[PDB]
Curated annotation (Swiss-Prot):
Assembly: Homodimer. Interacts with BAD. Interacts with PGAM5. Interacts with HEBP2. Interacts with p53/TP53 and BBC3; interaction with BBC3 disrupts the interaction with p53/TP53. Interacts with ATP5F1A and ATP5F1B; the interactions mediate the association of isoform Bcl-X(L) with the mitochondrial membrane ATP synthase F(1)F(0) ATP synthase. Interacts with VDAC1. Interacts with BCL2L11 (via BH3). Interacts with RNF183. Interacts with GIMAP3/IAN4 and GIMAP5/IAN5. Interacts with GIMAP5 and HSPA8/HSC70; the interaction between HSPA8 and BCL2L1 is impaired in the absence of GIMAP5.
Motif placement: BH2: 128-143
Residue ranges annotated as motif BH3: 34-48
Protein name as catalogued: Bcl-2-like protein 1
An annotated Gene Ontology molecular function: BH3 domain binding
Motif (BH1): 77-96
Family: Belongs to the Bcl-2 family.
Domain free text: The BH4 motif is required for anti-apoptotic activity. The BH1 and BH2 motifs are required for both heterodimerization with other Bcl-2 family members and for repression of cell death. The loop between motifs BH4 and BH3 is required for the interaction with NLRP1.
GO cellular component: Bcl-2 family protein complex; centrosome; cytosol; endoplasmic reticulum; membrane; mitochondrial inner membrane; mitochondrial matrix; mitochondrial membrane
Membrane topology: Single-pass membrane protein
Subcellular location: Mitochondrion membrane; Nucleus membrane; Cytoplasm, Cytoskeleton, Microtubule organizing center, Centrosome
Entry function: Potent inhibitor of cell death. Inhibits activation of caspases. Appears to regulate cell death by blocking the voltage-dependent anion channel (VDAC) by binding to it and preventing the release of the caspase activator, CYC1, from the mitochondrial membrane. Also acts as a regulator of G2 checkpoint and progression to cytokinesis during mitosis. Isoform Bcl-X(L) also regulates presynaptic plasticity, including neurotransmitter release and recovery, number of axonal mitochondria as well as size and number of synaptic vesicle clusters. During synaptic stimulation, increases ATP availability from mitochondria through regulation of mitochondrial membrane ATP synthase F(1)F(0) activity and regulates endocytic vesicle retrieval in hippocampal neurons through association with DMN1L and stimulation of its GTPase activity in synaptic vesicles.
């Protein structure tokens, strides 16, 4: 969806900025509270877990040739026991970590692609649980 892609792009842009990278590779109940709550959850999450998904990124070893199906299979790893608010946060951090790794690999073109994959994955596999458990309003309630 449009809002999903917007949420994803906001979180990724935020992580790249915060870590010294560019976010230009994208373009060329409210939404603000959700985005802010997500930026916060990610920071909180990354402060206690610093291994930045070494294993997962390894399994994927993303390149310009990687296909969505490969991405989807690696991420499912996070949801072997089903969806959680916490696992959703890890999902976003993972995407952020993937983007950073891509820039460090001189594969900045994958950033926008990664963003699309996350929006697709979020819409397909995550939103179902999210909507069943209070929607993003419940998310703000817990992470606001």
């Amino acid at each position: 969806s449009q809002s999903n892609r917007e949420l994803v792009v906001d979180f990724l842009s935020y992580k790249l900025s915060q870590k010294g990278y560019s976010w230009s590779q994208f373009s060329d109940i409210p939404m603000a509270a959700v985005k802010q709550a997500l930026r916060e959850a990610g920071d909180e999450f990354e402060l206690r877990y610093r291994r930045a998904f070494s294993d997962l990124t390894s399994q994927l070893h993303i390149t310009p040739g990687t296909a969505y199906q490969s991405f989807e299979q690696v991420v499912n790893e996070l949801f072997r026991d089903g969806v959680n608010w916490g696992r959703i946060v890890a999902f976003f951090s993972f995407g952020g970590a993937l983007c950073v790794e891509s820039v460090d690999k001189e594969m900045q073109v994958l950033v926008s692609r990664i963003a699309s994959w996350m929006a697709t994955y979020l819409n397909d596999h995550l939103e179902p649980w999210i909507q069943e458990n209070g929607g993003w309003d419940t998310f703000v309630d817990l992470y606001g």
